[PDB]
């Protein structure tokens, strides 16, 4: 599988880096995208290399999407390309995994009407106002959409997501 | 299985926390031991609860051992109780994973004579003087001992380690 992560500076470090390694473990290719190639820096000061700019991504290329949290989703969600990439991969029924603030991107993509998932509770209202049903669970699986709340949930988030790549 | 981590303040955050979730994912139990109960805090500011003191740990309790890196092993290596746990589990042939500065504990346990593995390169010489063969690779397996170097090696380190937990 080719697996795509969308992020930017201020990502929650664990929420990006642990899944990155978890997926490589399976021998999948992982690609990190952001505003531009280079490096991004997390809330806790870890860096990661960006493989692709949003501009250069063909949604079709990629088999699955990941949307980690932190502050990054607040600026990612303003990017038209990132929104398109997200809308397309999600409406195609490809596996999409979000955590924490990740769903801010899904909101801005307009894809949540009549879906069910979770998020950090601090944006619950905003998820509800996007027409999704919010629940408070460590992981939710709603067809292709696999969603968790915070870093404590990682093990369960990834337990369920890797199932979807098999 | 029950997996035991030995650590302290100054641990390299990823090297403790990602494997922690990795191993729960498989539905094993994970326990963190340090000098005393409470919380320890990583180099990059992540916090983890400590389940046990060293002086409460009985080696026979636990099925496998993990030794993350950072500044922590420099002080854990002085602790007789921690040494004795490590000596007993390693000589018993239980799976032992080490990364980065982790082997500082193995050195101090006197268990490395005739063994083969890797570490961060900054302590290569010290591993060699303890009587091991040092090689430079992203992961080595020497019987029950699975050793890596640094955080970029994570995916490989857990790939090979999880195998010994089956």
Helix/strand structural class of chain A: alpha/beta
- CATH superfamily caption of chain A: Class I glutamine amidotransferase (GATase) domain
Mind telling me the C-alpha Rg of chain A?
14 Å
Question: In angstroms, what separates the terminal alpha carbons of chain A?
Answer: 9 Å
Q: Which CATH C-level class of chain A is it?
A: Alpha Beta
CATH architecture of chain A: 3-Layer(aba) Sandwich
Q: Approximately how much beta-strand content do the residues of chain A carry?
A: 15-25%
Helix content of chain A: 25-40%
Anisotropy-based shape of chain A: globular
List the helices and strands of chain A in order: EHEEEEEHHEHEHEEEH
Strand order of the largest sheet of chain A: 5-2-1-6-7-11-10
Tally the helices of chain A. Answer: 6
What is the count of structural domains of chain A? Answer: 1
User: What fold name goes in the CATH topology slot of chain A?
Assistant: Rossmann fold
Instruction: Give the assembly state of these chains.
Output: homodimer
DSSP E strands of chain A, number: 11
- Can you summarize the main beta sheet of chain A? 7 strands, mixed
Identify the biggest protein-protein contact and residues per side: A-B, 17 and 17 residues
Protein name (chains A, B): Peptidase
Pfam family, one (chains A, B): DJ-1_PfpI
InterPro entries (chains A, B): C56_PfpI-like, Class_I_gatase-like, DJ-1/PfpI, Peptidase_C56_Deglycase
Family (chains A, B): Belongs to the peptidase C56 family.
């Amino acid at each position: 599988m080719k697996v795509l992560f969308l992020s930017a500076d201020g990502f929650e470090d664990l929420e990006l880096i642990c899944p990155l390694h978890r997926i490589k473990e399976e021998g999948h290719e992982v690609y990190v995208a952001s505003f531009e190639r280079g490096k991004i820096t997390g809330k806790h000061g870890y860096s990661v290399n960006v493989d692709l700019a949003f501009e250069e991504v063909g949604p079709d290329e990629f088999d699955a999407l990941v949307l980690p949290g932190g502050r990054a989703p607040e600026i990612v969600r303003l990017n038209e390309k990132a929104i398109e990439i997200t809308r397309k991969m999600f409406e195609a029924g490809k596996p999409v995994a979000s955590i924490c603030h990740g769903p801010q991107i899904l909101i801005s993509a307009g894809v949540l009407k009549g879906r069910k998932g979770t998020s950090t509770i601090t944006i619950r209202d905003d998820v509800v106002n996007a027409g999704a049903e919010w629940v408070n669970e460590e992981v939710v699986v709603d067809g292709n959409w696999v969603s968790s709340r915070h870093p404590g949930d990682l093990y369960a988030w990834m337990r369920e997501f890797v199932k979807l790549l098999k």
